[PDB]
Amino acid sequence: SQISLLLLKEIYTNGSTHIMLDILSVLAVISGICVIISKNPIVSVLHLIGLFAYVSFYLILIGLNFVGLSYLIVYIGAVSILFLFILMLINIRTSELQSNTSNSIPLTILVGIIISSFLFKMLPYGVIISKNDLFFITSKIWDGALAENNHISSIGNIMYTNYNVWLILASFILLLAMVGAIVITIKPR
Amino acid sequence: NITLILFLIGILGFVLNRKNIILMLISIEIMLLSITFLILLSSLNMDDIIGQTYAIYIIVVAGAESAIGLGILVAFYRLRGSIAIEY
Amino acid sequence: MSAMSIYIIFVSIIAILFLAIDLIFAPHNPYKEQSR
Amino acid sequence: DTGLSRDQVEREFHDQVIDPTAKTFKDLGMEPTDISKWTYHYLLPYRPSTYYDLPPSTEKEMREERKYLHVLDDQ
Amino acid sequence: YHPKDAVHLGLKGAAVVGGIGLLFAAVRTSLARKNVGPWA
Amino acid sequence: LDKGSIELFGPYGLERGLVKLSKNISSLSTSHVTTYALYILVGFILYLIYNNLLLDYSYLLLIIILLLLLMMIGE
Ligand SMILES: CCCCCCCCCCCCO[C@@H]1O[C@H](CO)[C@@H](O[C@H]2O[C@H](CO)[C@@H](O)[C@H](O)[C@H]2O)[C@H](O)[C@H]1O
Ligand SMILES: CCCCCCCCCCCCO[C@@H]1O[C@H](CO)[C@@H](O[C@H]2O[C@H](CO)[C@@H](O)[C@H](O)[C@H]2O)[C@H](O)[C@H]1O
Ligand SMILES: CCCCCCCCCCCCO[C@@H]1O[C@H](CO)[C@@H](O[C@H]2O[C@H](CO)[C@@H](O)[C@H](O)[C@H]2O)[C@H](O)[C@H]1O
């Protein structure tokens, strides 16, 4: 007699608002806009450190802590630091890097439409999943929850055994970036 | 949809750049953060750990291009004294 | 709400307040006054 | 002193009118100076000028940079 | 056979071919060496 | 004819046209990484347009042939 389907809020085991994702998208976009329009390369790298943070939080917020923390440790931690070193030691006259940006507005208009109209069709349904709105539903499992692993233990269970060839190539790419970058910069002895 | 927009930002960094070889360095990394970010969000959708791992190896190759890229840019600056493009 | 959220906001409030004592109570003189 | 108050705004509408019956600098053997000859002096401290704001370089000095090494590869 | 509206199809080529050439002029302005502006 | 239209409509005409054509195309190659990047993206867009709109193959050749003529024309 009464409606069989019943919808009610969750009092304690709740979760996060999906509103935060829409905020973190906006700032990531806003931060990214300032990267490619800023006059000073120091400032653009700062807007890059901001973008890497917003994307890192976006991922932590949706459950991907190890890689979201890996982005923090790797990009903001170390790559942008190397960028800051070089950019704070190279002499930069901030007017020789400034080009007439107003000319390229029409080409910005043109290439924005063409790329956006094509690539968006390529994306899968799950990524563009976000008036009757579809709700995603989840339920518990017991056989699959016996000894659950964090994402880093799951990556580790296969990173060094089944897909270990990927580790070999990466070890050699990092090793080449060591030898090659040392040999093209330093004066021997 | 955020992944595609952030890809455009990297593209548009190549559209608006006549003088910054540093912004060309930057926009390549914005483009890499789009593609890694897209792989990751689809991995959460399909319950696959290989998408997570593929992101990890993209992050490691991305840092290595920064070392090679900033190393070569140092070698150029030593003999040039300027990163500027006369135009 | 979660605990991690209330914790960052709390620290954020304290970090703002020490600005407030400085900007409210500390004096403020308007006068704020090439090689390779 | 916030620089704006009720009476100070009214001061904005008036213009200075020089009293013609009153003595001036000349009567004291003095010459006033204008403010245009002094702005550079009293505003020079308020001039943010770093290596960034410098003009784009010329071709002659770009050549001068090729006689220097701009990196110390042994330090 | 099935006749085709020549005027309609003719415009399509003008927009298709002309549309591409509009993108070429966009390249020309972006690579302009002076402050020529967007409406150039 | 022999020393005229046969050579103007032939080896001497082709010589004069092609040398001018190639001087113009090589006037594009400026060793400016900023300009090269735009050219790669331009060449990327045309590939996407071609092989997504299902444009007529003839539409492409008109563009290609029309381009070659503009490189024949100077200034
Ligand atoms: C972020 C949270 C919101 C903001 C909270 C903090 C608000 C800060 C502003 C209010 C307090 C201002 O603090 C006060 O500023 C004025 C103006 O600069 C200073 O005033 C000083 O310079 C002015 C210049 O016009 C003089 O006329 C004045 O006689 C002199 O005392 C005071 O020395 C300073 O103590
Ligand atoms: C159906 C159409 C015909 C089919 C294809 C026919 C193509 C034949 C055209 C070849 C054009 C001549 O090719 C070009 O000629 C000039 C001379 O004119 C040569 O130029 C040479 O001769 C000149 C003579 O003063 C000297 O400066 C020098 O010995 C050398 O530069 C070039 O080395 C050659 O590249
Ligand atoms: C018996 C017939 C034998 C036929 C042999 C094979 C013919 C080969 C076909 C193409 C020959 C080249 O054809 C020739 O093109 C060149 C440009 O490249 C033209 O060369 C010239 O064009 C105009 C004049 O018309 C000039 O202002 C221009 O400066 C110049 O490029 C010739 O006017 C044209 O006749």
Helix spans in chain C (H): 3-25
For residue A4, tell me if it sits in a domain. no
Alpha-carbon distance D27 to E27, whole Å?
Answer: 71
For residue A2, tell me if it sits in a domain. no
For residue B85, tell me if it sits in a domain. no
Q: How many domains does chain A have?
A: 1
Is there an atom of ligand 2 within 6 Å of F11 CB? yes
Alpha-carbon distance A14 to A11, whole Å?
Answer: 6
Alpha-carbon distance B41 to B30, whole Å?
Answer: 17
Which residue is closest to F41 within chain A, CA to CA? A111
Alpha-carbon distance D60 to D51, whole Å?
Answer: 19
Cβ of A185 and D73 within 8 Å? yes
Residues of F whose CB is below 8 A from E17 = 59, 62-63, 66
- The CATH number of residue B37's host domain is 1.10.287.3510
CA C33 and chain centroid, separation: 23
3 state SS of A89: coil
**Residue range(s) defining the domain that contains residue B57:** 1-80
Print burial letters for A12-27: b (CB count within 10 Å at least 16), e (below 16): eeeeeeeeebeebbee
Atom number of ligand 1 nearest to Cα C26: 35
Nearest ligand atom owner, CA of F14: 3
DSSP H or E stretch at residue F19: helix F11-26
Count Cβ–Cβ pairs < 8 Å, chain B vs chain F. 23
Measured CA distances, D65 to A93, C36, D68, D71, D74 (Å): 14, 10, 6, 12, 20
Count CB atoms within 10 A of the CB of residue A35.
Answer: 24
Alpha-carbon distance D25 to A185, whole Å?
Answer: 70
Q: What is the resolution of this structure in A?
A: 2.8
Alpha-carbon distance A156 to A173, whole Å?
Answer: 20
CA distance D24 to chain A (A): 50
- The CATH number of residue A152's host domain is 1.20.120.1200
| Rg of chain A over all Cα atoms, to the nearest angstrom | 23
Is there an atom of ligand 2 within 6 Å of F10 CB? yes
Alpha-carbon distance A184 to A189, whole Å?
Answer: 14
Helix spans in B1-87 (H): 2-15, 21-46, 50-80
For residue B60, tell me if it sits in a domain. yes
Nearest ligand atom owner, CA of F11: 2
Nearest to B62 by CA among A28, A79, E28, A14: A79
For residue A13, tell me if it sits in a domain. no
For residue A10, tell me if it sits in a domain. no
Is there an atom of ligand 3 within 6 Å of F11 CB? no
For residue A23, tell me if it sits in a domain. yes
Interface mutation target, options B11, B22, B35, chain A, most CBs of A under 10 Å? B22
Interface mutation target, options F36, F59, F69, chain E, most CBs of E under 10 Å? F59
CA A15 and chain centroid, separation: 22
For residue B74, tell me if it sits in a domain. yes
Residues of E whose CB is below 8 A from F59 = 13, 16-17
Atom number of ligand 1 nearest to Cα C16: 1
Which residue is closest to F46 within chain A, CA to CA? A114
- Of all protein residues, the one whose alpha carbon is nearest to atom 1 of ligand 3 is F6
Q: How many domains does chain B have?
A: 1
**Residue range(s) defining the domain that contains residue A100:** 18-184
For residue B61, tell me if it sits in a domain. yes
Alpha-carbon distance D26 to A16, whole Å?
Answer: 79
Tokens found for residue E18: 């002309």
For residue A59, tell me if it sits in a domain. yes
Alpha-carbon distance B32 to B51, whole Å?
Answer: 15
How many secondary structure helices (H) and strands (E) does chain F include?
Answer: 4, 0
Cβ of F59 and E17 within 8 Å? yes
The DSSP 8-state label assigned to residue B81 in this structure reads S
What approach was used to elucidate this structure? cryo-EM
Nearest to B8 by CA among F35, A51, F45, A111: A111
Backbone φ and ψ of A129, nearest 5°: -65, -25
- Whether there are 3 or more C-beta pairs closer than 8 Å between E and C is no
Cβ of E27 and F49 within 8 Å? no
For residue B56, tell me if it sits in a domain. yes
Alpha-carbon distance B25 to B62, whole Å?
Answer: 11
Count Cβ–Cβ pairs < 8 Å, chain A vs chain F. 9
For residue A92, tell me if it sits in a domain. yes
For residue A9, tell me if it sits in a domain. no
Backbone φ and ψ of C12, nearest 5°: -60, -40
Q: Give the list of residues 6+ apart from residue A156 with CB closer than 8 angstroms, or none.
A: none
| Strands of F1-75, DSSP E | none
